[PDB]
Amino acid sequence: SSDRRKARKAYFTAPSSQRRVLLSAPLSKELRAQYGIKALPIRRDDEVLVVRGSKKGQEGKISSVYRLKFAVQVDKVTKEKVNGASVPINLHPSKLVITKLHLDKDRKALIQRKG
Amino acid sequence: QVTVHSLTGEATANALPLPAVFSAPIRPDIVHTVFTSVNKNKRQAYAVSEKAGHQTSAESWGTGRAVARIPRVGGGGTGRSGQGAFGNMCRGGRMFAPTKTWRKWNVKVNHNEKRYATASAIAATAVASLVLARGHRVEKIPEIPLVVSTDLESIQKTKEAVAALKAVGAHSDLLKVLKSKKLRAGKGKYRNRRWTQRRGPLVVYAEDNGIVKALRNVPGVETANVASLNLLQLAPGAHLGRFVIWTEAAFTKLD
Amino acid sequence: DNVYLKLLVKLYTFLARRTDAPFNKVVLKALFLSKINRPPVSVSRIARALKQEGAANKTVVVVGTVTDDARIFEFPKTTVAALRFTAGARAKIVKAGGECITLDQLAVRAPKGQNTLILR
Amino acid sequence: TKTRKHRGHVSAGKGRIGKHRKHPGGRGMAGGEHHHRINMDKYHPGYFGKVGMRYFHKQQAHFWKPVLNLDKLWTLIPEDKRDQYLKSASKETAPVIDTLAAGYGKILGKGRIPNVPVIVKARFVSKLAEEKIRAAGGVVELI
Amino acid sequence: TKKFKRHHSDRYHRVAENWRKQKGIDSVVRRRFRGNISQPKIGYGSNKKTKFLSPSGHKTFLVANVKDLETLTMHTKTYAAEIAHNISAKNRVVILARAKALGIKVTNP
RNA sequence: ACUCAUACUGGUAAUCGAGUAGAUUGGCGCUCUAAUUGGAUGGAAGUAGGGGUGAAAACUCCUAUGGACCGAUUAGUGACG
RNA sequence: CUGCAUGGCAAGUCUAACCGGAGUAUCCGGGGAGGCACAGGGAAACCGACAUGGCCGCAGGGCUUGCCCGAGGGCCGCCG
RNA sequence: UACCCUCAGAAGGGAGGCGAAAUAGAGCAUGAAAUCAGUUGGCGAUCGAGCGACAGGGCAUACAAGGUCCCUCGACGAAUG
RNA sequence: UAUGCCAGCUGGUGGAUUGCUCGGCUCAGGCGCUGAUGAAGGACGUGCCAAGCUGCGAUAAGCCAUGGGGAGC
């Protein structure tokens, strides 16, 4: 990256397939093993740990997804606002860590026997 | 004479010769022109719109109302006459001059007064005091041409360069580098940002066809090859005897 | 213009003054003047001289460089210091005549103008 | 320098406002002729005048040098040793010219010569070149 | 001496105390005539060797770092330190102050 | 006069000290690049007001504000005042 | 184009485009084409010069302290 | 920007709450000058206009970073007829 | 001592200054044609609500297949 417009221009605007990356977080320190991989895509059925801003050290199920926005929710990540309706604050991946993965799928994009 | 050192740092072959353009006179004046000039040929090209402050339709009403002839009509007081000064004068302009981008920003140098301050540059290389005068700190009070062997070309990883720097004595120099990037206050912050991008100069490594990979990363060292060394690397920012190391192969251009 | 020029002039200031003769004082002055003044030299006339002075067992310094554009001194050793001279002047003012020297040398030598010739 | 200082003084250069502008008149040199005090002031650069000298033959199909003076040669020999090659007898001659661009090879005679005495061979030699040559030694050339 | 001030500085606002010459046209102060007071000229003040001196008598100047006090001695003001404005703050002028070590007195703070 | 010195020190000026145009000489600023090298959340740049230096272009400090960048030296660069 | 200050080299000096190398716009090596200088005079044809013969004399040097030698400079002579 | 007071009012204002900061509160860091409100010091409804420079008084404003100053006596004592 | 002058203080007005850079300017390397198979170009349409832009074309911000991608849209 750091080329110029590129590496950025074709970043945010692309694609609904590449986006999987950009939403990736680290595994636990048990999960790193138990299938090698430094990081995962983060799924709705996962678990996380906040490690980072505003909420540090607390986590609940992801309860969210992304797409264009490369963002996800947490459990009660956030709350009160002026509007009066509690809205979670979308954060990361970056700051988050995954300390639990839910693989409903038998094969979760080969998070096993990677090569 | 020059004394070669093996990649052990122990006194080794200790073989000469030195070049003959090492005996060079040494002119910082000449050196300063060529590489400072070189710096000039680095600036980018930009320009002002060819027709900015030219679209007219501004006229000056003649005398009558107390006013100065301009022409200044259209959009209220304004004009494209170059002189758009405060007060009664209006704004709008014209020929700010002259900057057109196509101007071949470059330099002017004679060939002789170029690589004459190349072989001055290298020249005040091997010296002692005006080695450590402008910067560079090395324990080695003795001869500082700093030859090596042909090997050292091969050293893949720096660390190993680090071993053979400590054992030469020059190596304190890398300790005394910016040894970090310092943002530079002042102008340059906006433009090519000197900003954090800055560091002290260091060792300089001269080699043959290749440039040493395991040396380039270092505190403030630059690597070059004999057939390509310029007046800039040697004598970094108009100065003289940067510390330097030459493989004993890349003696020098010697030509 | 820098180091070589500076030291040399300074040295031949502590020559005239510490010792006697004005040469090595005068020479300071010439150098302490525009470059397009000095030398010139051309080893021709650094030989036969208009003045009685010429070749003899004495040096003939020149303020400026010496250059080779002519014959060389005869049997006499007459070789002299000057600010550096290069090319045939040097290695030509050798053998016949004498060997040219740095003039700094002419500064460390007999101080006090000795038999010397201006030979501009 | 002085030029550097521009600000601080109103009007730079000649002091005046409404000072020197396009003047005195005409473009470049005013007409080389009379004008109403525009330009004149009795001249004689030029006088004659069509800049440069040119000869029609002078060009291709024109005679060419090289020319050598009988000074370098004598300086060359015998006083100092030089081109050892092309040395025989007390002395000899031959090409010692920067260019052997042809139509050439004369040797002028100026300076003090023979002195070598030297014998020279080349294309035609000037009269004051035979003398101070043929005198001590020297002679015919490039028949 | 008399506080030089450019004339009518205290008349039209924006004009500042910074003094300059008077306009040549009969402009009161020019043409020295009393009441205008001024016409700064050499000869007023600037005693030598004490042109710029702290009233304390200590040449006191410039400190914008803590290198700014190098071997500066706070005895007879070779360098009598003063921290510039436009210095960071306590953090900065903390290990600036605490210069106190080598005898150097800093003015305020 | 002494001196490398236009750094000191001592000495002479009754026979030196006004000045527009102008000539000469000592004391510039902007962008970005590079080498050497520094500063900043213990508060950078900018801004306002105020202190000091330089003949001067301009440099610098203090206080408030501001809340992340900013320099110096040398060699370059130019949509540089 | 013409000065000036500084610096390299010097009867020489500099490369241009371009080529090779490389640490790849820097830079190191190469390249001397060509330019200016090394002789001028003449429209041209064409011819072709003082590496010093004399005299004053500054600086500087020499001397036994006015007398010598006297570059540069100045005045002639001589030469194309 | 909840709640409360006010108001014709989902306006605006007051109060209050959030945040390191609201002169970060919606075309939303720092926050100069011109300039405005209130206020402090000095002057002021009998007195004259390039608005100041230099000199000297009034009134006005802890420490620090300056440490001096006054009187009698005495020692020294240029020029001063 | 009203009206009022000068300087400051608190608050404002204003948006300079400093710092910041999602934009410019310039140089460099690479690459280089499209259209009657309608660019090409234009018109008018097309959305739950739709004025502009973009995309599409009465199957109208779209339909199908394969591959990629992935828990959101």
Curated annotation (Swiss-Prot), chain A:
A GO molecular function for this record? Answer: RNA binding
**Which BP terms in the Gene Ontology apply to this protein?**
cytoplasmic translation; ribosomal large subunit biogenesis
A further note on this protein reads: There are 2 genes for uL24 in yeast.
What exactly does this protein do? Component of the ribosome, a large ribonucleoprotein complex responsible for the synthesis of proteins in the cell. The small ribosomal subunit (SSU) binds messenger RNAs (mRNAs) and translates the encoded message by selecting cognate aminoacyl-transfer RNA (tRNA) molecules. The large subunit (LSU) contains the ribosomal catalytic site termed the peptidyl transferase center (PTC), which catalyzes the formation of peptide bonds, thereby polymerizing the amino acids delivered by tRNAs into a polypeptide chain.
Q: Which family does it belong to?
A: Belongs to the universal ribosomal protein uL24 family.
The entry describes its oligomerization and partners as: Component of the large ribosomal subunit (LSU). Mature yeast ribosomes consist of a small (40S) and a large (60S) subunit. The 40S small subunit contains 1 molecule of ribosomal RNA (18S rRNA) and 33 different proteins (encoded by 57 genes). The large 60S subunit contains 3 rRNA molecules (25S, 5.8S and 5S rRNA) and 46 different proteins (encoded by 81 genes).
Descriptive protein name: Large ribosomal subunit protein uL24A
- What is the organism field in this record? Saccharomyces cerevisiae (strain ATCC 204508 / S288c) (Baker's yeast)
| Phylogenetic classification of the source organism | Eukaryota, Fungi, Dikarya, Ascomycota, Saccharomycotina
Gene name of the encoded protein: RPL26A
From Swiss-Prot, chain C:
Coiled-coil ranges per the record? none
Q: Which GO terms describe its biological process?
A: cytoplasmic translation
* Cross-link position per record: Glycyl lysine isopeptide (Lys-Gly) (interchain with G-Cter in ubiquitin): K95
The main location is cytoplasm
Tell me which UniProt keywords the record has, alphabetically.
Answer: Cytoplasm, Isopeptide bond, Methylation, Ribonucleoprotein, Ribosomal protein, Ubl conjugation
Q: To which protein family does this belong?
A: Belongs to the eukaryotic ribosomal protein eL18 family.
Q: Share what the entry says about its subunit structure, partners included.
A: Component of the large ribosomal subunit (LSU). Mature yeast ribosomes consist of a small (40S) and a large (60S) subunit. The 40S small subunit contains 1 molecule of ribosomal RNA (18S rRNA) and 33 different proteins (encoded by 57 genes). The large 60S subunit contains 3 rRNA molecules (25S, 5.8S and 5S rRNA) and 46 different proteins (encoded by 81 genes). eL18 interacts with NAP1.
Tell me the residues on which N6,N6,N6-trimethyllysine occurs. Answer: K29
Q: What else is known?
A: Present with 63700 molecules/cell in log phase SD medium. There are 2 genes for eL18 in yeast.
Q: Where in the cell is it found?
A: Cytoplasm
Q: Which GO terms describe its molecular function?
A: RNA binding; structural constituent of ribosome
Protein name as it appears in the record: Large ribosomal subunit protein eL18B
Q: Which GO terms describe its cellular component?
A: cytosol; cytosolic large ribosomal subunit
Swiss-Prot record, chain D:
Q: Which PROSITE patterns match?
A: RIBOSOMAL_L15
Motif stretch (Nuclear localization signal)? 2-8, 19-25
Q: What GO molecular function annotation could you give as one example from this UniProt entry?
A: structural constituent of ribosome
Region (Disordered) residue ranges read 1-34
Cross-linked residues for Glycyl lysine isopeptide (Lys-Gly) (interchain with G-Cter in ubiquitin) are K91
Query: Which InterPro entries does the annotation name?
Result: Ribosomal_uL15, Ribosomal_uL15/eL18, Ribosomal_uL15/eL18_sf, Ribosomal_uL15_CS
The record's keywords, sorted A to Z, are: Cytoplasm, Isopeptide bond, Ribonucleoprotein, Ribosomal protein, Ubl conjugation
Q: What is this protein called?
A: Large ribosomal subunit protein uL15
Name its cellular compartments. Answer: Cytoplasm
What is the protein's quaternary organization? Component of the large ribosomal subunit (LSU). Mature yeast ribosomes consist of a small (40S) and a large (60S) subunit. The 40S small subunit contains 1 molecule of ribosomal RNA (18S rRNA) and 33 different proteins (encoded by 57 genes). The large 60S subunit contains 3 rRNA molecules (25S, 5.8S and 5S rRNA) and 46 different proteins (encoded by 81 genes).
Q: What does this protein do?
A: Component of the ribosome, a large ribonucleoprotein complex responsible for the synthesis of proteins in the cell. The small ribosomal subunit (SSU) binds messenger RNAs (mRNAs) and translates the encoded message by selecting cognate aminoacyl-transfer RNA (tRNA) molecules. The large subunit (LSU) contains the ribosomal catalytic site termed the peptidyl transferase center (PTC), which catalyzes the formation of peptide bonds, thereby polymerizing the amino acids delivered by tRNAs into a polypeptide chain.
- The keyword Methyltransferase is assigned to this record: no
Q: Which family does it belong to?
A: Belongs to the universal ribosomal protein uL15 family.
Name the principal localization, coarsely classed.
cytoplasm
Instruction: Please give the superkingdom of this protein's source.
Output: Eukaryota
GO annotation terms (biological process): cytoplasmic translation
UniProtKB/Swiss-Prot annotation, chain E:
Can you name the source organism?
Answer: Saccharomyces cerevisiae (strain ATCC 204508 / S288c) (Baker's yeast)
Q: Its Gene Ontology biological processes?
A: cytoplasmic translation
Assign the protein's first listed, main location to one coarse class: cytoplasm
Protein name (record)? Large ribosomal subunit protein eL32
What's the stated role of this polypeptide? Component of the ribosome, a large ribonucleoprotein complex responsible for the synthesis of proteins in the cell. The small ribosomal subunit (SSU) binds messenger RNAs (mRNAs) and translates the encoded message by selecting cognate aminoacyl-transfer RNA (tRNA) molecules. The large subunit (LSU) contains the ribosomal catalytic site termed the peptidyl transferase center (PTC), which catalyzes the formation of peptide bonds, thereby polymerizing the amino acids delivered by tRNAs into a polypeptide chain.
Q: Which GO terms describe its cellular component?
A: cytoplasm; cytosol; cytosolic large ribosomal subunit
Q: Which residues carry this modification: Phosphoserine?
A: S27
**Alphabetical UniProt keywords:** Cytoplasm, Phosphoprotein, Ribonucleoprotein, Ribosomal protein
Which GO molecular-function terms appear in the entry?
A: structural constituent of ribosome
Localization per record: Cytoplasm
Quaternary organization: Component of the large ribosomal subunit (LSU). Mature yeast ribosomes consist of a small (40S) and a large (60S) subunit. The 40S small subunit contains 1 molecule of ribosomal RNA (18S rRNA) and 33 different proteins (encoded by 57 genes). The large 60S subunit contains 3 rRNA molecules (25S, 5.8S and 5S rRNA) and 46 different proteins (encoded by 81 genes).
Residue pairs linked by disulfide bridges in the UniProt entry: none
Q: Which gene encodes it?
A: RPL32
Give the UniProt family note: Belongs to the eukaryotic ribosomal protein eL32 family.
